[PDB]
């Protein structure tokens, strides 16, 4: 075959991986990975072009990103604007893309039966995109709106500010996102034809020698091979040289600098950065990984430990950060407590002391060896990935590794290279440092403004005395290298499947104190388990005060176990512990082999917990900030929040929590934990490589520990109170209106409540949702350009359900609302006119979506945990509900629309949350006339004036 330059050899895979692989290089220079998995419910492809923002023209910031939007909008094999995404939608698929500095990465998934159709529509993006003129004018708004969303986000502000304080002549300085000004307004003024410029960029850079493709389906390797060759050898090779950037964006003048910056949220952070050469080529020994592992360690003797003990910082991130071909960074980043902000010079001193300890001891092979072994285990035992993410990640790394080495390259670690370690470490020095501090205390004391985000800041040289006192960092006896990691798993046996192993979880214990659900894993056979526990207590959430105390206590506990648990996390054993509205959640995941040791430690600490005064004050203060900081979350996130507050029986607001928090004292917290712990019920799912007897053993010990140390006794059945959804009146329409004080965009969520969940009411709603899904995005966003964020779909809470739209926009919510209603009418007309073939396509897509099998253990646990915490316990739900779906008719869906959702439906139940932009006042399809809504004035008054739904009835 003359279409294929080369077929690759064996692709090194994990032993536990049952998928089959073949790499190849097409004659046009495209790198390919084909993945055959004959069990997959969804097939997938991705293509990654090794070009991005770093190559935008200097006078059209954002071109490559914009180009990336435009490729979705028609090709002239498939000129119909939304052909691609309508096809995926009717065949259970989904798609997305991103632009980074050097890559533009596109990907989809689709039902395994429609790979070729999906793939051929996709391949056209790369042959002849339309860039239609009127679609260009529309979609620049989506881009602009995407920038708008980020403008007031602290992380983007910082990301761009770093760019703006390095070499302005360096392409690292470029603004990558684009916006209406850079894409349309400034180019019109300059006489630039943006259409030509998209085409020119695509023609110059979308070349086959810069592309990798990955394709995953049911087909054999040979068939997938034919498929790829068919669709992609047509791609032109323009022989583009790969952009390289050997000059570091930070030169001499950009070093030994201090930046003091004003954030939007009340946060205090120190960012420390050193410029470093590109380390990518050393991937085999990865000295950057090695140094990050040490500098960023969190266990005893670590730099964090000390800083945290001094009461300076709570969290720390260390290690190498990507730049581009030719440069990288090494960062050490911390949060600051109020003392920490006064002690920045000391924090940095300590950073250098720790570094100097590494210098003094030299590189440690035993450490490198432990990283190597741990990576080897993680790779032997890796979870099977979802196809979409997997094709995308892999398409990205085919640019970096020989075909044969791509599955292994980002895991396996090979030769210890003490010498490269010293070369990197030797770049980590005071003469080489950039310091940034972020804090509201610089408000009014800054003299510079970043040009794209408007970020307020100041820049100063670090004085020579400071650099010198840092260069003299002596050693500090509080810094030691990590001890050997004792959590490393060593028992990997898959216990054989028991005589009466069940396919769904079985209830193997049911006492007053515990309900215990158990299933031995019958699909994955990895030495791993998931242990999930819900602990109910009425005192977790009885009142704002208490709800604050539940939270604080769990934080303080995590803070206290952190040194010990970090090791465990490195060894693939982790946990999650948080307060809920019912009392506490605890989850331990990872290799089964040492789970009981960590589990036991957690329950032991939790029941015998002694609070550190200094810790308590620090964490309380961070939580206070965390509560105020909600004001700077996105308008659409505000709308979802207020709706949850409105529709739930009991819910404390951030204002209520914040008010009640000054009253939380050390002595009341100390009294709170015993009370919290004294009476409990525990519901549990243990799922994994574990046996009935071991499960009982695990549960017994959780109990015996609580019982022993906390004297815990069971709860009454009637004390086990789940909460209700507000029941909306037939034909009611309510609006709650609030303002976001930070973002100059508005948000809205509209909720059409339907009825209690049940087989039929579930599938009516889900099918309608399916039918309107891409039309909603296509109309409200693509056609009308209301905003970058446009979502629609089912809302499920507290046993009830309904259909929701969320949108964020520069347009006022009253307007968004008429548009949604207009769209609903367009949707109705569209269902009346659609063919039976089309309708069954939708049933079929929904069906595939719901039956798609879990690919890893924890996705299967999440399904069961869903059924448990919601107390519906319907483990065979997908089968029942899909059989039922298959029965539904167009006429049915219409009658349901007509009784529940249409504007003059007898049972319409509508609530809208309107969140006004910072700055706003207190052709198209025909919008219908709407009633005067009842304006909600007070959430409590609203909840009280209304009935409450029942709770849903359970199954097993």
């Amino acid at each position: 075959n003359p279409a294929i330059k080369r077929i690759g050899n064996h692709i090194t895979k994990s032993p536990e991986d049952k998928r089959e692989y073949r790499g190849l290089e097409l004659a046009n220079g495209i790198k390919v990975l084909l993945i055959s998995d004959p069990t997959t419910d969804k097939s997938s492809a991705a293509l990654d072009v090794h070009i991005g923002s770093l190559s935008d023209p200097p006078n059209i910031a954002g071109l490559s990103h914009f180009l990336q939007h435009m490729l979705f909008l028609g090709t002239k094999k498939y000129p119909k604007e939304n052909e691609y995404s309508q096809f995926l939608s009717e065949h259970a698929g989904s798609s997305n893309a991103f632009t980074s500095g050097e890559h533009t990465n596109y990907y989809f998934d689709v039902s395994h039966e429609h790979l070729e159709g999906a793939l051929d529509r996709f391949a056209q993006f790369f042959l002849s995109p339309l860039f239609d003129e009127s679609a260009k004018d529309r979609e620049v708004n989506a881009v602009d709106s995407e920038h708008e969303k980020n403008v007031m986000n602290d992380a983007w502000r910082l990301f761009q500010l770093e760019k703006a304080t390095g070499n302005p002549k360096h392409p690292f300085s470029k603004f990558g996102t684009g916006n209406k000004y850079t894409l349309e307004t400034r180019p019109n003024q300059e006489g630039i034809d943006v259409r030509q410029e998209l085409l020119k960029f695509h023609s110059a850079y979308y070349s086959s020698n810069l592309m990798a493709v990955v394709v995953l389906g049911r087909e054999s390797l040979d068939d997938l091979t034919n498929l790829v060759v068919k669709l992609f050898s047509e791609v032109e090779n323009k022989n583009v040289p790969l952009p390289e950037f050997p000059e570091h964006p930070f030169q001499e003048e950009h070093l030994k600098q201090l930046y003091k910056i004003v954030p939007i949220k009340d946060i205090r952070n120190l960012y420390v950065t050193f410029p470093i050469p590109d380390l990518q080529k050393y991937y085999k020994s990865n000295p950057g990984h090695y140094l990050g592992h040490l500098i960023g360690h969190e266990g005893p003797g670590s730099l964090l430990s000390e800083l945290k003990s001094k009461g300076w910082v709570n969290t720390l991130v260390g290690g190498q950060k990507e730049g581009a071909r030719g440069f990288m960074f090494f960062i050490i980043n911390v949060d600051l407590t109020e003392e920490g902000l006064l002690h920045v010079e000391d924090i940095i001193l300590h950073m250098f002391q720790y570094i100097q300890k590494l210098r003094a001891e030299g590189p440690q092979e035993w450490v490198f060896q432990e990283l190597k072994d741990l990576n080897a285990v993680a790779f032997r035992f890796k979870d099977k990935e979802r196809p979409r993410g997997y094709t995308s990640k892999i398409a990205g790394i085919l640019h970096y590794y020989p075909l044969e080495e791509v599955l292994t390259a980002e895991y396996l670690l090979e030769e210890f290279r003490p010498d490269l370690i010293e070369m990197v470490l030797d770049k980590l020095r005071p003469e080489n440092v950039r310091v940034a501090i972020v804090s509201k205390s610089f408000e009014g004391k800054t003299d510079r403004t970043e040009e794209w985000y408007g970020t307020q800041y100041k820049q100063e040289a670090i004085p020579d005395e400071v650099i010198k006192k840092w260069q003299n960092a002596d050693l500090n006896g509080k810094f030691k290298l990590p001890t050997k990691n004792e959590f490393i798993p060593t028992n990997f046996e898959i216990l054989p499947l028991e005589k009466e192993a069940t396919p769904y979880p079985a209830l193997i214990k049911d006492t007053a104190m515990s309900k215990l659900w158990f299933k031995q894993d019958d699909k994955f056979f990895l030495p791993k388990a998931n242990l999930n526990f819900e602990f109910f207590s009425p005192f977790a959430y009885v009142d704002p005060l208490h709800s604050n105390m539940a939270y604080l206590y769990l934080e303080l506990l995590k803070d206290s176990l952190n040194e010990y648990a970090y090791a465990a996390e490195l060894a693939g054993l982790s946990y999650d512990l948080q307060n809920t509205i019912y009392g506490m959640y605890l989850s331990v995941k990872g290799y089964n082999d040492k789970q009981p040791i960590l589990l036991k430690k957690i329950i032991e600490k939790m029941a015998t917990f002694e609070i550190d005064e200094k810790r308590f004050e620090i964490i309380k203060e961070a939580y206070m900030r965390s509560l105020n900081n909600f004001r700077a979350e996105q308008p659409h996130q505000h709308a979802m929040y207020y709706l949850r507050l409105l529709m739930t029986e009991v819910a404390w607001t951030k204002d209520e929590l914040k008010e009640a928090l000054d009253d939380v004292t050390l002595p009341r917290l100390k009294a709170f934990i015993p009370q919290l712990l004294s009476r409990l019920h525990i519901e549990a799912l243990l799922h994994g490589n574990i046996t009935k007897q071991a499960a009982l053993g695990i549960m017994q010990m959780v109990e015996d520990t609580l019982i022993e140390h906390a004297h815990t006794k069971p709860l009454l059945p009637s004390q086990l109170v789940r909460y209700r959804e507000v029941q909306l009146p037939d034909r009611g329409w309510f609006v709650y209106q609030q303002r976001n004080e930070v973002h100059n965009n508005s948000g809205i969520e509209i909720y059409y409540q339907t009825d209690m969940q049940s087989t039929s009411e579930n599938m009516f709603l889900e099918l309608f949702a399916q039918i309107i899904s891409e039309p909603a995005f296509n109309t409200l966003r693509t056609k009308e350009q209301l905003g970058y964020i446009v979502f629609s779909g089912p809302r499920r809470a507290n046993g009830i359900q309904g259909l929701r739209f969320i949108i964020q926009s520069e347009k006022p919510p009253h307007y968004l609302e008429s548009r949604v209603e207009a769209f609903l009418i367009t949707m109705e007309k569209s269902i009346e006119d659609m063919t039976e073939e089309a309708f069954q396509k939708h049933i079929q897509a929904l069906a595939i979506r719901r039956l798609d099998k879990p690919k890893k253990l924890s996705a299967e646990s999440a399904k069961y945990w869903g059924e448990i915490i919601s107390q519906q316990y319907n483990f065979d739900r997908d089968n029942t509900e899909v059989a039922y779906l298959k029965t539904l008719t167009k006429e049915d869906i219409i009658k349901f629309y007509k009784e529940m959702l249409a504007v003059d439906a007898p049972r319409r139940h509508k609530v809208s949350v309107h969140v006004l932009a910072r700055e706003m006042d207190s052709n198209l399809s025909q919008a219908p006339a709407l009633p005067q809504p009842e304006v909600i004035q007070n959430m409590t008054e609203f909840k009280r004036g209304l009935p409450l739904f029942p709770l849903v009835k359970p199954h097993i």
Binding site: H289, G292, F777
Partner: peptide
């Protein structure tokens, strides 16, 4: 511990 993409949809 050991150590920015613009998307088409969220």
């Amino acid at each position: 511990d050991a150590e920015k993409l613009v998307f088409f949809a969220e």
